[PDB]
Amino acid sequence: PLKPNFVGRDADGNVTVDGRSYPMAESVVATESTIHRSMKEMAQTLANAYKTLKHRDTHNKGNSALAPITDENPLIIISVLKGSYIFTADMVRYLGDCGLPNVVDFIRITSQVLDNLRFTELTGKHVLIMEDIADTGRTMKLLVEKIRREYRPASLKVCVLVDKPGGRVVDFKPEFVCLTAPTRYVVGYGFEVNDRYRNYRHVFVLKPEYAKRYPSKL
Amino acid sequence: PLKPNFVGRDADGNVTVDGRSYPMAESVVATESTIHRSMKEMAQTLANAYKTLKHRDTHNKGNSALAPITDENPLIIISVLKGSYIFTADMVRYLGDCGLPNVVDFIRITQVLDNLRFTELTGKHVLIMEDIADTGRTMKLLVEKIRREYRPASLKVCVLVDKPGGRVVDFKPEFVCLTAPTRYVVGYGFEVNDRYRNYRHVFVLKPEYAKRYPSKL
Ligand SMILES: Nc1nc2c(ncn2[C@@H]2O[C@H](COP(=O)(O)O)[C@@H](O)[C@H]2O)c(=O)[nH]1
Numbered sequence: 001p002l003k004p005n006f007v008g009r010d011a012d013g014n015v016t017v018d019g020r021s022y023p024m025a026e027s028v029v030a031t032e033s034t035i036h037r038s039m040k041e042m043a044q045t046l047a048n049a050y051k052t053l054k055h056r057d058t059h060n061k062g063n064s065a066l067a068p069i070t071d072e073n074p075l076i077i078i079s080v081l082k083g084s085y086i087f088t089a090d091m092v093r094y095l096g097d098c099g100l101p102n103v104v105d106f107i108r109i110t111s112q113v114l115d116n117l118r119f120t121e122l123t124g125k126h127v128l129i130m131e132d133i134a135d136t137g138r139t140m141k142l143l144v145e146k147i148r149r150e151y152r153p154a155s156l157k158v159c160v161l162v163d164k165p166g167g168r169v170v171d172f173k174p175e176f177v178c179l180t181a182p183t184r185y186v187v188g189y190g191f192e193v194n195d196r197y198r199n200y201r202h203v204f205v206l207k208p209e210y211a212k213r214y215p216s217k218l
Numbered sequence: 219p220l221k222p223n224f225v226g227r228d229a230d231g232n233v234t235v236d237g238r239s240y241p242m243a244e245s246v247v248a249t250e251s252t253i254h255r256s257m258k259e260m261a262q263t264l265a266n267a268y269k270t271l272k273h274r275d276t277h278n279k280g281n282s283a284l285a286p287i288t289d290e291n292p293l294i295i296i297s298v299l300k301g302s303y304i305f306t307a308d309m310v311r312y313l314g315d316c317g318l319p320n321v322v323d324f325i326r327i328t329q330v331l332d333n334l335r336f337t338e339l340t341g342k343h344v345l346i347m348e349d350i351a352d353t354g355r356t357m358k359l360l361v362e363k364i365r366r367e368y369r370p371a372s373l374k375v376c377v378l379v380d381k382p383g384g385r386v387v388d389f390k391p392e393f394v395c396l397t398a399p400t401r402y403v404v405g406y407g408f409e410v411n412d413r414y415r416n417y418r419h420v421f422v423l424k425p426e427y428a429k430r431y432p433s434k435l
Pocket residue numbers: 083111132133134135136137138139140164184185186187191192193
């Protein structure tokens with residue numbers, strides 16, 4: 001993933017990355033190597049932010065003292081399906097590289113809650129939401145409020161792969177931001193049009209003429 | 219991921235991979251570079267198996283002819299949560315390298331906890347991506363259910379790990395990355411009460427660690 005990537009155009013005028021054409025792409029927001037550089041650095045930022053904190057001991061319920069973040073009481077990561085699963089898969093491995101014990105549960109929402117968390121012991125825990133992109137801010141603002149009210153974690157913060165601060169309509173600022181995008185619809189590396197393009201290794205601005213390309217329900 | 223990993227033992231006799239100690243590990247099943255080599259080879263295998271197949275056109279429903287596998291009508295991948303999500307993340311990008319259009323939806327089972335949201339699977343080629351087959355009961359039941367309820371044109375299973383020595387029902391995955399003995403493994407998607415899931419290598423767990431984390435998450 002961290003081999004340098006070469007952006008160009010083919011003879012048809014389509015964007016290429018490393019010689020492969022992407023007819024749906026207007027431009028390149030970030031290539032694979034750029035994305036993974038930001039994720040590795042972000043994992044270290046996260047390790048540094050969390051590794052000395054303490055929170056409620058649920059490994060041993062007979063204990064009353066707050067406990068360090070360990071395999072016994074790891075950082076709780078809430079990963080928002082579907083858009084975050086690839087991002088989360090790469091991030092948790094880089095967090096392992098940095099020695100930060102964590103466990104992952106998923107929640108699936110619209111942008112409301114389709115699939116609930118199955119972790120039940122979040123009160124008094126350090127909890128980190130891993131989310132694909134913040135645009136108007138409304139989805140995360142609502143999710144953060146929901147988790148805070150239902151569980152009352154010791155802390156609740158958001159890490160996004162991409163922030164689009166130009167789209168904000170509510171006051172919402174993710175504590176941790178890997179990449180920033182212009183105020184456009186992006187696809188690639190988790191981002192999709194009706195699930196297409198999600199498995200690409202780079203993030204692109206979608207051509208407007210592709211926005212309605214796959215209207216048939218899956 | 220694909221530079222060869224060094225496997226050793228530290229002064230305490232614990233397994234090391236690239237200088238990092240894993241006290242919960244009895245031994246290494248496969249390191250990261252080996253796993254990713256097997257996944258890249260599997261992605262080519264999958265692309266060869268599917269690239270020329272034809273299935274129902276739901277992109278243009280006015281077309282009665284079967285249609286090739288394309289962005290318009292991709293391979294449907296069902297990924298089994300939670301155990302398959304890292305395997306699936308890596309595999310779909312290798313499938314992209316091999317030019318096989320695909321889309322992923324998730325099903326959560328433990329019993330079915332969270333159903334698919336895709337609904338239009340009739341007459342589609344569908345591939346299940348799963349972490350490990352042991353007794354085979356889990357996949358035998360999932361396959362029967364998907365066949366019955368969705369009626370795909372074809373339904374196959376790709377597992378990261380097969381433990382054929384544990385097979386005790388009529389189930390055989392079509393596509394297998396790695397084959398392992400009948401031992402409990404952890405790392406790279408495999409866990410003990412969610413621990414060790416984010417490690418980059420697959421290990422045999424020490425039996426002493428099997429009950430290390432009894433408390434509900
Ligand atoms: N694929 C894609 N989805 C986006 C983009 N911007 C926002 N989203 C979607 O909208 C959600 C956030 O919406 P918000 O509530 O912040 O406006 C994201 O989680 C994602 O589903 C984008 O540029 N590309």
